[PDB]
Amino acid sequence: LTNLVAEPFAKLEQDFGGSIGVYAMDTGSGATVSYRAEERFPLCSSFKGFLAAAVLARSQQQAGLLDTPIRYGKNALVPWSPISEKYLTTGMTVAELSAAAVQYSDNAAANLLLKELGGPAGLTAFMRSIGDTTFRLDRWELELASAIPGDARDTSSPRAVTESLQKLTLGSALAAPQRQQFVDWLKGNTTGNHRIRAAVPADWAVGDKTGTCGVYGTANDYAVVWPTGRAPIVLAVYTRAPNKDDKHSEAVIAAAARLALEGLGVNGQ
């Protein structure tokens, strides 16, 4: 049930000038589409979705964690912190920081939550606890986004991303209220309109988390998609390219998502 119908991913990545990695899972039948799915790609900001899930998991054992007010100084305000910069003089709650990290890819929020979990190793430990042996986070924002060719730091594979996303949004890795909160944060993401969402018809529900490194043509998106009348689809699309100055492409991510849905036989656009 893997790649029952071949799709022209190779042509797509050649036109892009780099590598595209795709893993898509039909959670009804278990059928999959897979292209470079076990290669490592930089997570970039896409780690922030798993970060929020790790916070939610901790909130199962610490009641009131999400309501905790967090104060921070100007030195916490990393570039691209569009929400946390507006609350510098007031602070934000853990839940607000988590929503900002997921929905606006807020870097200061992400680093504040990373510190709450014990740093990159703490997030990595959470991923190990759900059975993901591929994920590794090694650094903080923005150093984690160097996207160096061949560097395994701050990477995962499209397959491991999809498998973990399925466990967290649809499976049993989170308790039911925390699972729906994670889904609701992903549904409210504002940064992904030109990526997987551009391949998903307007009448289907969808949540996603993007990542964009800014170098080495490196960008990505993962999503859970609910086509009407059938089981949800989980998918991950990651890209990279050989040269530091190579540009990423949102259109290539959307096109790869379209091919994945076509390969799964999901009638879409």
Residue numbers in the entry: 25 to 57, 59 to 252, 254 to 295
Task: Reproduce the article's own wording on this structure.
To further investigate the role of Asn170 in penicillin and carbapenem hydrolysis, we determined the X-ray structure of the KPC-2 N170A apoenzyme as well as product complexes with ampicillin and imipenem. The structure of the N170A apoenzyme is very similar to that of the wildtype KPC-2 apoenzyme with the only major difference being the smaller alanine side chain at position 170, which creates a pocket not found in wildtype and thus expands the volume of the active site in this region. Asn170 along with Glu166 coordinates the hydrolytic water molecule critical for the deacylation reaction. Since sharply decreased values of both kcat and KM are consistent with impaired deacylation in the β-lactamase kinetic scheme, we hypothesized that the N170A substitution results in a decreased rate of deacylation of the carbapenem substrates. To test this hypothesis, single turnover kinetics were performed for the N170A enzyme with imipenem, revealing a modest 5-fold decrease in the acylation rate (k2) but a 2800-fold decrease in the deacylation rate (k3) as compared with wildtype KPC-2 such that deacylation is strongly rate limiting for imipenem hydrolysis in the mutant. Based on this evidence, we speculate that the impaired deacylation of imipenem observed with the KPC-2 N170A enzyme is due to the C6-hydroxyethyl side chain occupying the cavity created by the substitution and displacing the catalytic water molecule.
Class A β-lactamases, including KPC-2, hydrolyze the amide bond in β-lactam antibiotics through sequential acylation and deacylation steps. The catalytic Ser70 residue attacks the carbonyl carbon of the β-lactam resulting in cleavage of the amide bond and formation of a covalent acyl-enzyme intermediate. Subsequently, Glu166 activates a catalytic water molecule for attack on the carbonyl carbon of the acyl-enzyme leading to hydrolysis of the ester bond between Ser70 and the drug. However, the emergence of the KPC-2 carbapenemase has resulted in widespread resistance to these drugs, suggesting it operates more efficiently.
